A and B are shown apart, each in its own frame.
With several copies, the nearest count.
Chain A
Amino acid sequence: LPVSKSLETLLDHLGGLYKFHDRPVTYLYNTLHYYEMCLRNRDHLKRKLVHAIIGSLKDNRPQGWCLSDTYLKHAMNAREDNPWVPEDSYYCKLIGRLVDTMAGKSPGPFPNCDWRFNEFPNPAAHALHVTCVELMALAVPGKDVGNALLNVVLKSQPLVPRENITAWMNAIGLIITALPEPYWIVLHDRIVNVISSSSLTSETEWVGYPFRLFDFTACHQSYSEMSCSYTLALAHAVWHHSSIGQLSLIPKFLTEALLPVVKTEFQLLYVYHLVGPFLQRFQQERTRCMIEIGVAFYDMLLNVDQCSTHLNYMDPICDFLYHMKYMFTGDSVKEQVEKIICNLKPALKLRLRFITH
């Protein structure tokens, strides 16, 4: 840690290193993979490396990077504690910039010099590393990234509009699929642990009608805006954006944590809303885990068979699983599911006696 100030002075003597391209995304990822959890020494190093990297990047005059200068103007004194407190509203401005990158003030200060040599196929490419360097400042982010995002979602700041929300959804999806693993890893417990069992077991409320509210786009009015709905929306966003390698850990996840949480049937509809619409992404390249997902759902059946008196909307799940089998898996997982569906309820047997065939 201590003599690292000498290499800081050295890079100050080597500003020319950053006179060609600003692509520290990979240089932070590969050197931060297992570091965010144990960054304490690197945290104290960044305590002084913040201004060092800022000046190293400042070897230009397009006045394009403001979030760094915004932190600088917000870091006049005691830079170890203050600039990380009001981040949510700050993040608003952050996501604000992003929600202005696609439809807003397009000819802004961001695209310039020269739109084709600063690695500009799109302003989001520049959004990448600025978001990275912003969230790489402290250590409590990454764990706090998804938390603050969910906050600015439900604790909607007066700057966050409610009509063009889907742009913000795409924005959060991009910023999540851009940041490394210890940053988006919080979304698992953000969806399954926070609200998926808020009360949601037997006497939740008269809100039990699942279809009209649990699916998104129901909050088109100022009414019909449930927290579970916005949570599912944030989910689907991060699912579609990160549909490259982040989804690859999802099957085991469902087998690890989603088992002792499913109690009621609308919990089953919720986890279906979470998992289903992205299975074809696996089918494209990751077929080898589909069966897992399959039996995962099948395992859920067992639960919704034990602690359950009656099933009102069961036939939706029946035909859902039917087309799950016939359109995607086919005669592939027959032997594994044979030993698991034998424990179902008489109605489920009467529904899936052709599935077992």
Chain B
Amino acid sequence: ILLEGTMNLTGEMQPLVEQLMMVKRMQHIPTPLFVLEIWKACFVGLIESPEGTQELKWTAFTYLKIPQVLVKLKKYFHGEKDFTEDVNCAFEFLLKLTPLLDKADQRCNCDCTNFLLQECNKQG
């Protein structure tokens, strides 16, 4: 996800979901740990590497990748833990590591309000 976001933030309608399915089923595939890894990915950037407009590209890539994983969860699997409680424990694991959001605030200066707003937006 890091490489894809850093290389081509556009022209990526849905090949990345295909590669995600590939690396998932052709490996240990824990859906909760999966979304944890992808979230740690989309937030590990946007803070260290970018300094200017690259941060804008980073946030745009994150807010494009969240509908990607959303439609992934919608179309990929259905019948056993249909991406409802796994997402719950995923966001719980996220909330466990507070220094993540601490660095997010050190970077964006409004990561609390912006975080709540992007959360309720993704809740669309």
Contact = CB atoms under 8 A, between A and B. Distances in A.
Contacts of B40: 221, 223-224
Interface string A134-155: 0000000000000000000011
Interface stretch (A225-233, A256-264, A320-328): A225-233
Given A162-B103, A222-B44, A205 B97 contact: no
Contacts, number: 49
B44 A205 contact: no
Contact of A205 (B96, B100, B103): B96
Contacts of B43: 222-223
Given A154-B98, A225-B99, A205 B92 contact: yes
Given A158-B106, A206-B32, A222-B48, A227 B92 contact: no
Given A222-B44, A222-B48, A227 B93 contact: no
B93 A154 contact: no
Contacts of A156: 99, 102-103, 106
B29 to A, nearest CB: 15
A219 interface: yes
Q: Is the contact region of chain B dominated by helix, strand, or loop, or is it mixed?
A: helix
The residue among A154, A162, A206 with the most chain B CB atoms within 10 A of its own CB is: A206
Contacts of A317: none
A206 B89 contact: yes
Contacts of B20: none
Contact of B103 (A206, A207, A222): A222
B44 A227 contact: no
B98 to A, nearest CB: 6
B107 to A, nearest CB: 9
A221 B44 contact: yes
Interface of B: 32-33, 36, 40, 43-44, 47-48, 89, 92-93, 96-100, 102-103, 106
Given A154-B102, A205-B89, A223 B96 contact: no
17 contacts: A154-B99, A155-B102, A156-B99, A156-B103, A156-B106, A162-B103, A207-B93, A221-B40, A221-B44, A222-B47, A222-B48, A224-B40, A224-B97, A225-B100, A225-B103, A227-B98, A227-B99
Contacts of B44: 221-223
Given A206-B36, A222-B43, A223-B100, 13 more contacts: A154-B99, A156-B102, A205-B92, A207-B96, A219-B99, A221-B40, A222-B48, A222-B103, A223-B40, A223-B43, A223-B44, A227-B98, A227-B99
Contacts of B92: 205-206
